[PDB]
Amino acid sequence: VKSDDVNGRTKMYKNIVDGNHQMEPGMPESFNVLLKEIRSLGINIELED
Amino acid sequence: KTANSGYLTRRLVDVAQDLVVTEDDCGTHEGIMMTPVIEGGDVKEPLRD
Amino acid sequence: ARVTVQDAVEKIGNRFDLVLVAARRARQMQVGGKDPLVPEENDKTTVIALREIEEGLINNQILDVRERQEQQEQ
Amino acid sequence: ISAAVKEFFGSSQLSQFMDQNNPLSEITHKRRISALGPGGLTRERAGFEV
Amino acid sequence: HRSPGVFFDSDKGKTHSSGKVLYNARIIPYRGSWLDFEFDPKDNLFVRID
Amino acid sequence: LLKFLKAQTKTEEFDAIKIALASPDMIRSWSFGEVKKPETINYRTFKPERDGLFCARIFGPVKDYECLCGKYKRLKHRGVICEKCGVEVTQTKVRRERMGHIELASPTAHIWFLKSLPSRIGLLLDMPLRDIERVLYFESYVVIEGGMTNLERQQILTEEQYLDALEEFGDEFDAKMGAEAIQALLKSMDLEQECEQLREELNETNSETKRKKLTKRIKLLEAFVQSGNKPEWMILTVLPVLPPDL
Amino acid sequence: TAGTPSGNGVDYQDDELPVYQGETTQSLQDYLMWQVELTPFTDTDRAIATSIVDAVDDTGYLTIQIEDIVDSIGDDEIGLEEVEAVLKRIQRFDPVGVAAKDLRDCLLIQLSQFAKETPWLEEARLIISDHLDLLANHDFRTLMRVTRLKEEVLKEAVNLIQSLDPRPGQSIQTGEPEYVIPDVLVRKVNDRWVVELNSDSLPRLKINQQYAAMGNSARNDADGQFIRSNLQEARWLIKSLESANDTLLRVSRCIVEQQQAFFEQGEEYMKPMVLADIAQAVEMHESTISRVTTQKYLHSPRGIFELKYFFSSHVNTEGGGEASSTAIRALVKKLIAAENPAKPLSDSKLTSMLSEQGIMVARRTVAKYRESLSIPPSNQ
DNA sequence: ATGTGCAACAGCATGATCGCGGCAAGCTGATCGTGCAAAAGTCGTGCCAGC
RNA sequence: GCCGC
DNA sequence: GCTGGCACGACTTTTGCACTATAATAGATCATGCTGTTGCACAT
Ligand SMILES: [Zn+2]
């Protein structure tokens, strides 16, 4: 919430202003950048279900 | 010496990161032998400690 | 003001579960649909929930039975 | 000529901003001996004896 | 910095783990390529130019 | 076709991240297009160059829901590709997701696998890394097949030896000194029979020196067959590129 | 250099592998979205708000029509009544008056947010703003009679109207005027107006390319010699850059040679030089010269900073030989400004004056030159 | 009694070497010409509608 | 890089 | 009658195709794994 969740930042700020104190976390952007980096080599890495 | 201390702490933390108390009682009868630490004519650690 | 949470810890002894119990009680008393069962002394919901746990009238089982009762009511 | 001279004077490891707190810091900085530099010894290459 | 000239060293005599002390000689010019002489643990004269 | 939330669907449930080699077909599947010009942007109009490292026909648009040439620049148009430019009206946040690729027109070897002390190619083909590096840089030839001639399967004959063989053997000598040669020799391998021969050699003869090498080689072989990867993919012919926004 | 500026603000991301990383900037649309996210809106209301704030221009005005917004939604029960309410709610954001359909609406909303007790609230709320705006554009002499009000009161109502912000939302911009002029073509004044070139960096590039490529090749650590592996790429790059600088310098020298008079004495002394004029001078095709001198910039003490502003083919059928319409436009601007307070500046009169001066130009062209960067001073 | 197989030693390449914060300082550029159809774009000029 | 812990 | 925004026939500009010898430089350990060469032990 505090660093990389682009939607999480706005959602948590909106909750704080409203007075909800709820998190609703997500996926940090840094992991997406790392995945794109590793995929930019000849290596495949994916988030399976 | 701070660099050596930091490297050692990093290695210890990583080698022991994934250890968690996940059970109430294993029920094993095994154990280790506890005796006060003696060395020549001097005592370092009594059994109580 | 709960400076120390020892009694609340001993009421439900894990030091980890009471965090979740107080979190859910504070959600009930803050989001809505609930009122404190202890006199409110201009305190935040967190310490009100902690005091309720300390007094012995809040725990996971009764929270679950109240949730079931409200679910069946509607 | 100008490029080399100005590159040495303006951008070098052994030509740094002088301290201006007190006259003592200026005096100390002016007569300062450094082991680093272009032809010197780097920080991590330094043993316990140097 | 180190003055140009000739320096003889013994590298503390702990390299081959046999207790044999190794002597080396270095010639350092102000500008140019270094020249070096070294002792093998089999007592052979070896140079390390540049 | 309104009230679409592609931001909410961006987050999906997942578990157990997995890693494997990427085939050229998979790299093409990731790609939204192919780049062919080296310059990133032109200074003529301060716009990304067509089919370049920084482009807008691929990688998505450059400024919100606008498109190049300004034919379709508004939110009313969605997912529409202009006739003048292949730019698609999109939230311009896909500059961090679309990958693209390049075609090499000549196979090259992955430095990830060839250059490492336990080299996977070298111990997968049971040859030293030195001669593999020599052939990969056109220093020497490597022959394949040639059963009729006296040349072996993994010969390391040099240029002079190649000329001598051409003068003497003439045909039947199939030797190449590029990455195509190593690719072909990796393709021609029959992996299951190789593993069976390894097992037979390991159990028949016992020696503390060759046992470790045979165990490592059979371990790599069984890992390759079970994992579903193809050893040809170690060398790559299609190279992906990073999104511009990263 | 007698006076030199201190170094301008600059930085580069350090102790971070993706060097220079980035830095987010807050624009008008981003601020509008941030404000929208913190007000109670329904899902349909949120969608309408996003759709209408996407259409906000840089100046803060709506570019697309409201009916076009309704069509953009493309859903039932989202008729214009709802989008009107949503837009009217949106207008009262931090840049009060943002997302306004027209000037009238902007002034109406700006005047709406007030104490409701100002001396001339109702005087200019609709009598001046919502009515007779075109009259207020002119001297508004008949506006006093039209609104049945004294001219003294209108003298303060006009000031009150002018006190409002004309273009709200343009005070939010975070862009920096860093679009300064490289002026790669420097020029000084001499006995023959010599032209030089700066910012070549060719010696620096040659030295760096040497010390990298030929430095590695001369280094004996690698087996063999990299006589063509690295050495024969720096040579190609240096030759290409030298050729580019050479043709740029040749084109610039041709340009100054044919345009010496523009720089000498009066400024408006440009000949109507065509691309073929320089093409024959440098023995090169016109397309390459056009691609070369189309955004290159020169640094002149008095002349303009461009290399395409001189390239005009505007013979205009001048009396004696040919002329350039740039000088004609400059003369028209100079003469129109220096005229009587009435300032007729009639198109026929201007054409007659130009013909008397020697510029045989039709009366319809002069109207175009005037309208390009000016308006007729009540010439109608 | 000479020849073949295997274990050990020396040389070589690879990887790593504590955090957090404040001044600071340099900018890391470009590229190429082609000569021609083919296209798009532009300018001097004349038109009708409003005052 | 210089300095502070 | 006077004036001010719209189109047309030459000119002008843009764009893909398209092939183009000299030199910074060497000042840590410390451990680990792999490769090539040599010496010790067994066989007909
Ligand atoms: Zn487009």
PDB file of N, CA and C and ligand atoms in Angstrom, chain F residues 66-73 80-89, ligand 1:
ATOM      1  N   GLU F  66      -5.242   9.324 -27.121  1.00  0.00           N
ATOM      2  CA  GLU F  66      -4.953   9.904 -28.422  1.00  0.00           C
ATOM      3  C   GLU F  66      -4.164   8.918 -29.276  1.00  0.00           C
ATOM      4  N   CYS F  67      -4.166   9.167 -30.582  1.00  0.00           N
ATOM      5  CA  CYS F  67      -3.449   8.338 -31.536  1.00  0.00           C
ATOM      6  C   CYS F  67      -2.642   9.226 -32.471  1.00  0.00           C
ATOM      7  N   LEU F  68      -1.659   8.617 -33.128  1.00  0.00           N
ATOM      8  CA  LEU F  68      -0.796   9.355 -34.041  1.00  0.00           C
ATOM      9  C   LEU F  68      -1.610   9.935 -35.192  1.00  0.00           C
ATOM     10  N   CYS F  69      -1.195  11.121 -35.653  1.00  0.00           N
ATOM     11  CA  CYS F  69      -1.841  11.867 -36.733  1.00  0.00           C
ATOM     12  C   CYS F  69      -3.164  12.464 -36.255  1.00  0.00           C
ATOM     13  N   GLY F  70      -3.610  12.070 -35.064  1.00  0.00           N
ATOM     14  CA  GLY F  70      -4.796  12.653 -34.469  1.00  0.00           C
ATOM     15  C   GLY F  70      -6.097  12.347 -35.173  1.00  0.00           C
ATOM     16  N   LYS F  71      -6.164  11.247 -35.924  1.00  0.00           N
ATOM     17  CA  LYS F  71      -7.406  10.894 -36.606  1.00  0.00           C
ATOM     18  C   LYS F  71      -8.483  10.484 -35.607  1.00  0.00           C
ATOM     19  N   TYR F  72      -8.121   9.656 -34.628  1.00  0.00           N
ATOM     20  CA  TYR F  72      -9.037   9.197 -33.587  1.00  0.00           C
ATOM     21  C   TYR F  72      -8.406   9.502 -32.235  1.00  0.00           C
ATOM     22  N   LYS F  73      -8.785  10.633 -31.632  1.00  0.00           N
ATOM     23  CA  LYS F  73      -8.245  11.055 -30.336  1.00  0.00           C
ATOM     24  C   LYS F  73      -9.403  11.451 -29.421  1.00  0.00           C
ATOM     25  N   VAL F  80      -9.649   0.908 -31.556  1.00  0.00           N
ATOM     26  CA  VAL F  80      -9.739   1.134 -32.993  1.00  0.00           C
ATOM     27  C   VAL F  80      -8.348   1.456 -33.517  1.00  0.00           C
ATOM     28  N   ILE F  81      -7.970   0.809 -34.614  1.00  0.00           N
ATOM     29  CA  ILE F  81      -6.674   1.014 -35.247  1.00  0.00           C
ATOM     30  C   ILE F  81      -6.875   1.943 -36.436  1.00  0.00           C
ATOM     31  N   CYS F  82      -6.166   3.068 -36.435  1.00  0.00           N
ATOM     32  CA  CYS F  82      -6.296   4.037 -37.512  1.00  0.00           C
ATOM     33  C   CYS F  82      -5.744   3.470 -38.816  1.00  0.00           C
ATOM     34  N   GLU F  83      -6.223   4.022 -39.932  1.00  0.00           N
ATOM     35  CA  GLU F  83      -5.726   3.591 -41.233  1.00  0.00           C
ATOM     36  C   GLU F  83      -4.331   4.143 -41.503  1.00  0.00           C
ATOM     37  N   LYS F  84      -4.102   5.417 -41.172  1.00  0.00           N
ATOM     38  CA  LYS F  84      -2.792   6.019 -41.405  1.00  0.00           C
ATOM     39  C   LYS F  84      -1.722   5.385 -40.525  1.00  0.00           C
ATOM     40  N   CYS F  85      -2.046   5.124 -39.260  1.00  0.00           N
ATOM     41  CA  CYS F  85      -1.094   4.568 -38.311  1.00  0.00           C
ATOM     42  C   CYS F  85      -1.744   3.419 -37.556  1.00  0.00           C
ATOM     43  N   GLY F  86      -0.939   2.423 -37.199  1.00  0.00           N
ATOM     44  CA  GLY F  86      -1.446   1.255 -36.505  1.00  0.00           C
ATOM     45  C   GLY F  86      -1.685   1.492 -35.027  1.00  0.00           C
ATOM     46  N   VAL F  87      -1.532   2.746 -34.594  1.00  0.00           N
ATOM     47  CA  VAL F  87      -1.717   3.087 -33.189  1.00  0.00           C
ATOM     48  C   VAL F  87      -3.151   2.796 -32.776  1.00  0.00           C
ATOM     49  N   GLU F  88      -3.314   2.217 -31.591  1.00  0.00           N
ATOM     50  CA  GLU F  88      -4.620   1.859 -31.057  1.00  0.00           C
ATOM     51  C   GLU F  88      -4.938   2.727 -29.846  1.00  0.00           C
ATOM     52  N   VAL F  89      -6.178   3.208 -29.782  1.00  0.00           N
ATOM     53  CA  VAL F  89      -6.631   4.020 -28.656  1.00  0.00           C
ATOM     54  C   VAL F  89      -6.615   3.147 -27.405  1.00  0.00           C
TER      55      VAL F  89
HETATM   56 ZN    ZN K   1      -3.963   7.316 -35.816  1.00  0.00          ZN
END
